[PDB]
Design a protein around this ligand. Structure first.
Ligand SMILES: [Mg+2]
Ligand SMILES: [Mg+2]
Ligand SMILES: [Mg+2]
Ligand SMILES: [Mg+2]
Ligand SMILES: [Mg+2]
Ligand SMILES: [Mg+2]
Ligand SMILES: [Mg+2]
Ligand SMILES: [Mg+2]
Ligand SMILES: [Mg+2]
Ligand SMILES: [Mg+2]
Ligand SMILES: [Mg+2]
Ligand SMILES: [Mg+2]
Ligand SMILES: [Mg+2]
Ligand SMILES: [Mg+2]
Ligand SMILES: [Mg+2]
Ligand SMILES: [Mg+2]
Ligand SMILES: [Mg+2]
Ligand SMILES: [Mg+2]
Ligand SMILES: [Mg+2]
Ligand SMILES: [Mg+2]
Ligand SMILES: [Mg+2]
Ligand SMILES: [Mg+2]
Ligand SMILES: [Mg+2]
Ligand SMILES: [Mg+2]
Ligand SMILES: [Mg+2]
Ligand SMILES: [Mg+2]
Ligand SMILES: [Mg+2]
Ligand SMILES: [Mg+2]
Ligand SMILES: [Mg+2]
Ligand SMILES: [Mg+2]
Ligand SMILES: [Mg+2]
Ligand SMILES: [Mg+2]
Ligand SMILES: [Mg+2]
Ligand SMILES: [Mg+2]
Ligand SMILES: [Mg+2]
Ligand SMILES: [Mg+2]
Ligand SMILES: [Mg+2]
Ligand SMILES: [Mg+2]
Ligand SMILES: [Mg+2]
Ligand SMILES: [Mg+2]
Ligand SMILES: [Mg+2]
Ligand SMILES: [Mg+2]
Ligand SMILES: [Mg+2]
Ligand SMILES: [Mg+2]
Ligand SMILES: [Mg+2]
Ligand SMILES: [Mg+2]
Ligand SMILES: [Mg+2]
Ligand SMILES: [Mg+2]
Ligand SMILES: [Mg+2]
Ligand SMILES: [Mg+2]
Ligand SMILES: [Mg+2]
Ligand SMILES: [Mg+2]
Ligand SMILES: [Mg+2]
Ligand SMILES: [Mg+2]
Ligand SMILES: [Mg+2]
Ligand SMILES: [Mg+2]
Ligand SMILES: [Mg+2]
Ligand SMILES: [Mg+2]
Ligand SMILES: [Mg+2]
Ligand SMILES: [Mg+2]
Ligand SMILES: [Mg+2]
Ligand SMILES: [Mg+2]
Ligand SMILES: [Mg+2]
Ligand SMILES: [Mg+2]
Ligand SMILES: [Mg+2]
Ligand SMILES: [Mg+2]
Ligand SMILES: [Mg+2]
Ligand SMILES: [Mg+2]
Ligand SMILES: [Mg+2]
Ligand SMILES: [Mg+2]
Ligand SMILES: [Mg+2]
Ligand SMILES: [Mg+2]
Ligand SMILES: [Mg+2]
Ligand SMILES: [Mg+2]
Ligand SMILES: [Mg+2]
Ligand SMILES: [Mg+2]
Ligand SMILES: [Mg+2]
Ligand SMILES: [Mg+2]
Ligand SMILES: [Mg+2]
Ligand SMILES: [Mg+2]
Ligand SMILES: [Mg+2]
Ligand SMILES: [Mg+2]
Ligand SMILES: [Mg+2]
Ligand SMILES: [Mg+2]
Ligand SMILES: [Mg+2]
Ligand SMILES: [Mg+2]
Ligand SMILES: [Mg+2]
Ligand SMILES: [Mg+2]
Ligand SMILES: [Mg+2]
Ligand SMILES: [Mg+2]
Ligand SMILES: [Mg+2]
Ligand SMILES: [Mg+2]
Ligand SMILES: [Mg+2]
Ligand SMILES: [Mg+2]
Ligand SMILES: [Mg+2]
Ligand SMILES: [Mg+2]
Ligand SMILES: [Mg+2]
Ligand SMILES: [Mg+2]
Ligand SMILES: [Mg+2]
Ligand SMILES: [Mg+2]
Ligand SMILES: [Mg+2]
Ligand SMILES: [Mg+2]
Ligand SMILES: [Mg+2]
Ligand SMILES: [Mg+2]
Ligand SMILES: [Mg+2]
Ligand SMILES: [Mg+2]
Ligand SMILES: [Mg+2]
Ligand SMILES: [Mg+2]
Ligand SMILES: [Mg+2]
Ligand SMILES: [Mg+2]
Ligand SMILES: [Mg+2]
Ligand SMILES: [Mg+2]
Ligand SMILES: [Mg+2]
Ligand SMILES: [Mg+2]
Ligand SMILES: [Mg+2]
Ligand SMILES: [Mg+2]
Ligand SMILES: [Mg+2]
Ligand SMILES: [Mg+2]
Ligand SMILES: [Mg+2]
Ligand SMILES: [Mg+2]
Ligand SMILES: [Mg+2]
Ligand SMILES: [Mg+2]
Ligand SMILES: [Mg+2]
Ligand SMILES: [Mg+2]
Ligand SMILES: [Mg+2]
Ligand SMILES: [Mg+2]
Ligand SMILES: [Mg+2]
Ligand SMILES: [Mg+2]
Ligand SMILES: [Mg+2]
Ligand SMILES: [Mg+2]
Ligand SMILES: [Mg+2]
Ligand SMILES: [Mg+2]
Ligand SMILES: [Mg+2]
Ligand SMILES: [Mg+2]
Ligand SMILES: [Mg+2]
Ligand SMILES: [Mg+2]
Ligand SMILES: [Mg+2]
Ligand SMILES: [Mg+2]
Ligand SMILES: [Mg+2]
Ligand SMILES: [Mg+2]
Ligand SMILES: [Mg+2]
Ligand SMILES: [Mg+2]
Ligand SMILES: [Mg+2]
Ligand SMILES: [Mg+2]
Ligand SMILES: [Mg+2]
Ligand SMILES: [Mg+2]
Ligand SMILES: [Mg+2]
Ligand SMILES: [Mg+2]
Ligand SMILES: [Mg+2]
Ligand SMILES: [Mg+2]
Ligand SMILES: [Mg+2]
Ligand SMILES: [Mg+2]
Ligand SMILES: [Mg+2]
Ligand SMILES: [Mg+2]
Ligand SMILES: [Mg+2]
Ligand SMILES: [Mg+2]
Ligand SMILES: [Mg+2]
Ligand SMILES: [Mg+2]
Ligand SMILES: [Mg+2]
Ligand SMILES: [Mg+2]
Ligand SMILES: [Mg+2]
Ligand SMILES: [Mg+2]
Ligand SMILES: [Mg+2]
Ligand SMILES: [Mg+2]
Ligand SMILES: [Mg+2]
Ligand SMILES: [Mg+2]
Ligand SMILES: [Mg+2]
Ligand SMILES: [Mg+2]
Ligand SMILES: [Mg+2]
Ligand SMILES: [Mg+2]
Ligand SMILES: [Mg+2]
Ligand SMILES: [Mg+2]
Ligand SMILES: [Mg+2]
Ligand SMILES: [Mg+2]
Ligand SMILES: [Mg+2]
Ligand SMILES: [Mg+2]
Ligand SMILES: [Mg+2]
Ligand SMILES: [Mg+2]
Ligand SMILES: [Mg+2]
Ligand SMILES: [Mg+2]
Ligand SMILES: [Mg+2]
Ligand SMILES: [Mg+2]
Ligand SMILES: [Mg+2]
Ligand SMILES: [Mg+2]
Ligand SMILES: [Mg+2]
Ligand SMILES: [Mg+2]
Ligand SMILES: [Mg+2]
Ligand SMILES: [Mg+2]
Ligand SMILES: [Mg+2]
Ligand SMILES: [Mg+2]
Ligand SMILES: [Mg+2]
Ligand SMILES: [Mg+2]
Ligand SMILES: [Mg+2]
Ligand SMILES: [Mg+2]
Ligand SMILES: [Mg+2]
Ligand SMILES: [Mg+2]
Ligand SMILES: [Mg+2]
Ligand SMILES: [Zn+2]
Lengths: 107, 95, 97, 70
RNA sequence: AGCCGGUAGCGGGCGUGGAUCCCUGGAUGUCCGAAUGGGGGAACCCGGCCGGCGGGAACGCCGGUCACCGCGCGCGCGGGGGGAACCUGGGGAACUGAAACAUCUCAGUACCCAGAGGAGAGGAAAGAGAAAUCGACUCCCUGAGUAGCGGCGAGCGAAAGGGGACCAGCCUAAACCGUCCGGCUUGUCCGGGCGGGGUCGUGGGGCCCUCGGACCGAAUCCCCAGCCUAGCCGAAGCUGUUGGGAAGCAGCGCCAGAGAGGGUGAAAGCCCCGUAGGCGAAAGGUGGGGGGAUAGGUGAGGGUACCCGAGUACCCCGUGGUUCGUGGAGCCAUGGGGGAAUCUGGGCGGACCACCGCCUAAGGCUAAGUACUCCGGGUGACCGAUAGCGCACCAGUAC
RNA sequence: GAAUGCCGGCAUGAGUAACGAUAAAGAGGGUGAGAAUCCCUCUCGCCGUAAGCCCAAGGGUUCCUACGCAAUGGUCGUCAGCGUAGGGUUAGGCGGGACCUAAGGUGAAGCCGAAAGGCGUAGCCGAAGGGCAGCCGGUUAAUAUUCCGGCCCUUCCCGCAG
RNA sequence: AAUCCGCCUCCCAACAAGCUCUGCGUGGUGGGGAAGCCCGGGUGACAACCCCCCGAAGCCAGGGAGCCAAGAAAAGCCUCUAAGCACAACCUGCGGGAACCCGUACCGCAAACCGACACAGGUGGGCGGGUGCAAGAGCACUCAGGCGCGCGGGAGAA
């Protein structure tokens, strides 16, 4: 019915695996069809660009490459640790994500 | 619901259609099922004019392909209405 | 050849069995079948025309059920039948079956 | 069209009478033709307008039908 | 919390005031198609009547309506067409086997047709068949390759009984009573409709005397639980190291009603999706389970001899069904001829007869247990792109 | 490892036969990376009851223009009935329909047949037959009895008059 | 039903006329208009646009004769009357308005149709000029128009 995403634009994530294991950053974008996220300044790649109006002088640009969403973990804004998410039902009762290490909301 | 604006789809944009403006002949793409009598009325209520003559012809969609895939463009009808002496359809004079 | 409007008797299929030889019961060696082929047995259909309510009604009926038409006429006396068409009369009559 | 403007269209439409709905559709169908013409000579950069209008007309006709349905 | 299908781009927009998306219900739904105003070379053409639009009478468009057949009093209701297998009924081969071939086999199969439906058929004994017996029907095991049938060849092949599955029985016709309507041959008339009555094999009912005077309960209806059509919660890992990448190796931990399985840059219980265990429907569908209602159901002697399904039984002729191929050939069915009776009647127990028993024909209905798999899901000592469906891919396509 | 097996790939024959009518060519100029093969000119030859022109079938965008040459073209290709794109088909009078009927088809009535279905005076359908009002010229890259121009005409509705 | 059509009789007309329909000619008017010469277009040009001959298988047409094998239907159209209706209706003349849907490009004896091919095959109807050969749609040459057939260049054996 919908792809499940534990992370979203733009909470703060630890990149927990791959060349950039350890980095922290904001999620610029979430791509559910690919099950991927863009994290700011993580997975940079060099891309060739043709001499074009969009890019006179041509040469190359840097692009951020998507990461498999499973490589990424939200950092709790209360306790500051990378966490799994739990859901908690409020009194509304809307439901929310909460850090699983302490109890804080993650938004 | 059916209105004059469902009968006239778009004006015809071509050197041939423009050449008709001079003598009061306006050429529209119309709905393929529309009758001369009905187009007469539709044009008159949409452009506040008096239609004196209506010519219609069917235009077959061209066959076209993108790679592997053979297809066809939609079939169309075009209509050429003549307005009363002196009248003009300004939306078309345009150009 | 067809269907009895009264009994529903209809053509049926039968075998025609051809035999040669002397029956055992008569001291013979026995019967041998020299042929079996399908055939039909039809009802003995005939036409029966009757005046009922000043109209001429006709029935296609097996001979066995010829009296059943007249009995229907009797039972018809109790009916408002005058002025109907012969198709309509026949329906009322048949409905009595 | 913005979601809030859609609600707003439905509320305003639902207050109208069949006849007023007919006039309004006819005007919107007219406004669509103007748009079509502009798209065809390349002067309609704001092309989302066409999808929009077409759905307003739907929504209105949908409501007209509500009104007449009983 | 993203989104404007595959699908990027141009060019523009939408969404926590909750979008996209999923489920339910509704609206719109050109033309063709049963196709149904009429015509027709399907997807086009041409009309009638009512209403509307345009300047509108001609012309055109928009809305509504108009086929035929059946049943019931012009109007109502219904029918028509489709569906992969399954099912019943009406018809119905041949190769082949018989080491030739005709009876026989293949086979009442293939196939054509009609019809049904989520099943269909069958079903409440005129049964079985030897038991002093059983007790509707269906379906499985067995009985049994028995009994038998058979150019006694090739081959064909039951049933009772026993073990199971499921379980349920009902409504009429007739006697007689009442009512409406019709008939001419005027009533103690005949006939048609409707209602009452009645439903059985220890025979039962009717009618006339006598005596006696609340329980059961649907297969119909209503409510509800449960179920389906979207979903949701869901335990526990960090560090170092090699490496493009750790989930590998190393160190120290933790969860477990969860160590099924799939992902993640390689090999991960603890990263993701899940899993165990739980939760969930405003709407539509189901509801064989629970509850309620309603229809419907229920006595005993005694007398009477009124009724108890007709071109029927029964006999003969021609055939089919059965294991039964003419046989000692009954039984069930019926195309032809003949042709009864109402229980002191009738059919049956393998020619026939007697005796002794069994059973009540010629009206109808009836869940479940059974079959199938277009559809959804689960699972494989199933395939892995010459395989597996004809098709993993835009295939019933190109050709 | 064999089934003139099946599917696929690739060899051999072989730089071989052939390149599809023996109506036939030559030159100059242009264009282009490239030219016997495309464009233009002159010369030559062939058809001319056709190998020219107009209709109907059938075909279905093949038409005109611009940009192209991988493949298609029996060679080549700058060209093309090829690729991409854009344009192009205009009717009261032509043809068919809103007219007629032919064979035949279908088919109220009606007849027949296990089912499916087969017939069937009327009617209906059915044409390249009957019936019915447009000729000449001009215009586009590409349509013209269709657009335009000139001169003519048909039916239907309404009205007026006789 | 009928005043129509058929049949009988009489009067007048009869290889005529009259009435009617068509072909052709003319006809207000509107168009076209060569070679050659310049770059499809300009000019030629104020173009001329006349006389004679030949002459259809086409037209008048539903013409004529002869023959035997004896040669569609139905509507349009005219006429007759019936229900009706006779303020209607129909006919004639004039005027104003109204006049729908489909086809139409292009190939079309062929490289675009039928033959798996840009295939020496097959494909119905009309037009099909001139001269000469008795005639002709034959034959030769040739007009308009269209082509040299989508491999070529050499060589000069069997
Ligand atoms: Mg969720
Ligand atoms: Mg680190
Ligand atoms: Mg919520
Ligand atoms: Mg609509
Ligand atoms: Mg032009
Ligand atoms: Mg209109
Ligand atoms: Mg047209
Ligand atoms: Mg398309
Ligand atoms: Mg016989
Ligand atoms: Mg014997
Ligand atoms: Mg003996
Ligand atoms: Mg024998
Ligand atoms: Mg008789
Ligand atoms: Mg008999
Ligand atoms: Mg008899
Ligand atoms: Mg898209
Ligand atoms: Mg953009
Ligand atoms: Mg964008
Ligand atoms: Mg909500
Ligand atoms: Mg829906
Ligand atoms: Mg439409
Ligand atoms: Mg339809
Ligand atoms: Mg129809
Ligand atoms: Mg029809
Ligand atoms: Mg209609
Ligand atoms: Mg009207
Ligand atoms: Mg007007
Ligand atoms: Mg009107
Ligand atoms: Mg209509
Ligand atoms: Mg049926
Ligand atoms: Mg059905
Ligand atoms: Mg059968
Ligand atoms: Mg039958
Ligand atoms: Mg049979
Ligand atoms: Mg046969
Ligand atoms: Mg045989
Ligand atoms: Mg065999
Ligand atoms: Mg054998
Ligand atoms: Mg044999
Ligand atoms: Mg043999
Ligand atoms: Mg033999
Ligand atoms: Mg045999
Ligand atoms: Mg066999
Ligand atoms: Mg058999
Ligand atoms: Mg059968
Ligand atoms: Mg089968
Ligand atoms: Mg059916
Ligand atoms: Mg079931
Ligand atoms: Mg059942
Ligand atoms: Mg049943
Ligand atoms: Mg019973
Ligand atoms: Mg045994
Ligand atoms: Mg057998
Ligand atoms: Mg037996
Ligand atoms: Mg048993
Ligand atoms: Mg048992
Ligand atoms: Mg069971
Ligand atoms: Mg009676
Ligand atoms: Mg009585
Ligand atoms: Mg009575
Ligand atoms: Mg008794
Ligand atoms: Mg019941
Ligand atoms: Mg979860
Ligand atoms: Mg987890
Ligand atoms: Mg490293
Ligand atoms: Mg690690
Ligand atoms: Mg370890
Ligand atoms: Mg487990
Ligand atoms: Mg595992
Ligand atoms: Mg795993
Ligand atoms: Mg491991
Ligand atoms: Mg492993
Ligand atoms: Mg794992
Ligand atoms: Mg569970
Ligand atoms: Mg669960
Ligand atoms: Mg008693
Ligand atoms: Mg009695
Ligand atoms: Mg009985
Ligand atoms: Mg009876
Ligand atoms: Mg017998
Ligand atoms: Mg037998
Ligand atoms: Mg014997
Ligand atoms: Mg027997
Ligand atoms: Mg009999
Ligand atoms: Mg007895
Ligand atoms: Mg007796
Ligand atoms: Mg018996
Ligand atoms: Mg007997
Ligand atoms: Mg006996
Ligand atoms: Mg017995
Ligand atoms: Mg018995
Ligand atoms: Mg039954
Ligand atoms: Mg039950
Ligand atoms: Mg069952
Ligand atoms: Mg099953
Ligand atoms: Mg499945
Ligand atoms: Mg595998
Ligand atoms: Mg493969
Ligand atoms: Mg395969
Ligand atoms: Mg492979
Ligand atoms: Mg498949
Ligand atoms: Mg395959
Ligand atoms: Mg395949
Ligand atoms: Mg394909
Ligand atoms: Mg070998
Ligand atoms: Mg070989
Ligand atoms: Mg070979
Ligand atoms: Mg082979
Ligand atoms: Mg091999
Ligand atoms: Mg092979
Ligand atoms: Mg091979
Ligand atoms: Mg080779
Ligand atoms: Mg060589
Ligand atoms: Mg050689
Ligand atoms: Mg050689
Ligand atoms: Mg050779
Ligand atoms: Mg060759
Ligand atoms: Mg050679
Ligand atoms: Mg050649
Ligand atoms: Mg050659
Ligand atoms: Mg030669
Ligand atoms: Mg040259
Ligand atoms: Mg040169
Ligand atoms: Mg060249
Ligand atoms: Mg070249
Ligand atoms: Mg050449
Ligand atoms: Mg050239
Ligand atoms: Mg020659
Ligand atoms: Mg000549
Ligand atoms: Mg073709
Ligand atoms: Mg093409
Ligand atoms: Mg053209
Ligand atoms: Mg083209
Ligand atoms: Mg071209
Ligand atoms: Mg070019
Ligand atoms: Mg090429
Ligand atoms: Mg090339
Ligand atoms: Mg090349
Ligand atoms: Mg290309
Ligand atoms: Mg090629
Ligand atoms: Mg080439
Ligand atoms: Mg070739
Ligand atoms: Mg070039
Ligand atoms: Mg070409
Ligand atoms: Mg092209
Ligand atoms: Mg015209
Ligand atoms: Mg009309
Ligand atoms: Mg017609
Ligand atoms: Mg007709
Ligand atoms: Mg027929
Ligand atoms: Mg006929
Ligand atoms: Mg007609
Ligand atoms: Mg015609
Ligand atoms: Mg004609
Ligand atoms: Mg016409
Ligand atoms: Mg015409
Ligand atoms: Mg004319
Ligand atoms: Mg042309
Ligand atoms: Mg053109
Ligand atoms: Mg004109
Ligand atoms: Mg007057
Ligand atoms: Mg008379
Ligand atoms: Mg003249
Ligand atoms: Mg004249
Ligand atoms: Mg000139
Ligand atoms: Mg010149
Ligand atoms: Mg001049
Ligand atoms: Mg001068
Ligand atoms: Mg003559
Ligand atoms: Mg006739
Ligand atoms: Mg007629
Ligand atoms: Mg009168
Ligand atoms: Mg008059
Ligand atoms: Mg006039
Ligand atoms: Mg019409
Ligand atoms: Mg058209
Ligand atoms: Mg055509
Ligand atoms: Mg044209
Ligand atoms: Mg043309
Ligand atoms: Mg050509
Ligand atoms: Mg041509
Ligand atoms: Mg030829
Ligand atoms: Mg020809
Ligand atoms: Mg040609
Ligand atoms: Mg060809
Ligand atoms: Mg070809
Ligand atoms: Mg060629
Ligand atoms: Mg050829
Ligand atoms: Mg020929
Ligand atoms: Mg001569
Ligand atoms: Mg000569
Ligand atoms: Mg000569
Ligand atoms: Mg000549
Ligand atoms: Mg010649
Ligand atoms: Mg020349
Ligand atoms: Mg040549
Ligand atoms: Mg040599
Ligand atoms: Zn925290």
């Amino acid at each position: 019915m919908r792809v499940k995403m534990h992370v979203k634009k733009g909470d703060t994530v630890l990149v927990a695996s791959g060349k950039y294991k350890g980095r922290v950053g904001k999620v610029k974008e979430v791509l559910p069809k690919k099950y991927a996220v863009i994290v700011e300044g993580v997975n940079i790649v060099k891309k060739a660009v043709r001499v074009s109006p969009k890019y006179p002088q041509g040469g190359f640009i840097e692009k951020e490459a998507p990461l498999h969403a499973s490589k990424v973990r939200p950092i709790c804004p209360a306790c500051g640790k990378p966490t799994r998410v739990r859901k908690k039902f409020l009194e509304n009762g809307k439901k929310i994500r909460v850090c699983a290490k302490c109890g804080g909301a993650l938004d | 619901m059916k209105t004059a604006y469902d009968v006239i789809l778009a004006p015809v944009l071509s050197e041939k259609a423009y050449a008709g403006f001079a003598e009061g002949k306006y050429t529209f793409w119309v709905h393929p099922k529309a009758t001369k009598t009905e187009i007469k009325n539709a044009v008159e209520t949409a452009f506040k004019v008096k239609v004196v003559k209506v010519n219609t012809l069917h235009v077959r969609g061209k066959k076209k392909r993108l790679g592997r895939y053979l297809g066809k463009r939609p079939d169309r009808k075009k209509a050429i209405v003549q307005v009363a002496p002196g009248q003009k359809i300004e939306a078309l004079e345009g150009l | 050849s067809k269907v009895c409007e009264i009994s529903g008797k209809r053509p049926i299929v039968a075998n025609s069995i051809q035999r040669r030889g002397k029956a055992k019961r008569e001291g013979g060696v026995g019967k041998k079948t020299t042929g079996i082929s399908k055939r039909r047995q039809y009802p003995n259909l005939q036409k029966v025309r009757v005046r009922v309510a000043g109209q001429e009604i006709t029935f296609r009926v097996a001979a066995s059920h010829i009296p059943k038409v007249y009995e229907l006429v009797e039972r018809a006396k109790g009916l408002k039948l005058e002025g109907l068409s012969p198709k309509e009369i026949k329906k009322e009559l048949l409905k009595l079956l | 069209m913005k979601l809030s403007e859609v609600r707003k269209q439905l509320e305003e439409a639902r207050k109208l009478s069949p006849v007023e709905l007919e006039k309004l559709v006819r005007e919107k169908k007219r406004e669509l033709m103007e748009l079509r013409f502009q798209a065809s000579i390349g002067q309609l950069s704001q092309n989302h307008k066409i999808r929009d209008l077409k759905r307003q007309i739907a929504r209105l006709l949908t409501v007209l039908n509500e009104k007449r349905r009983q």
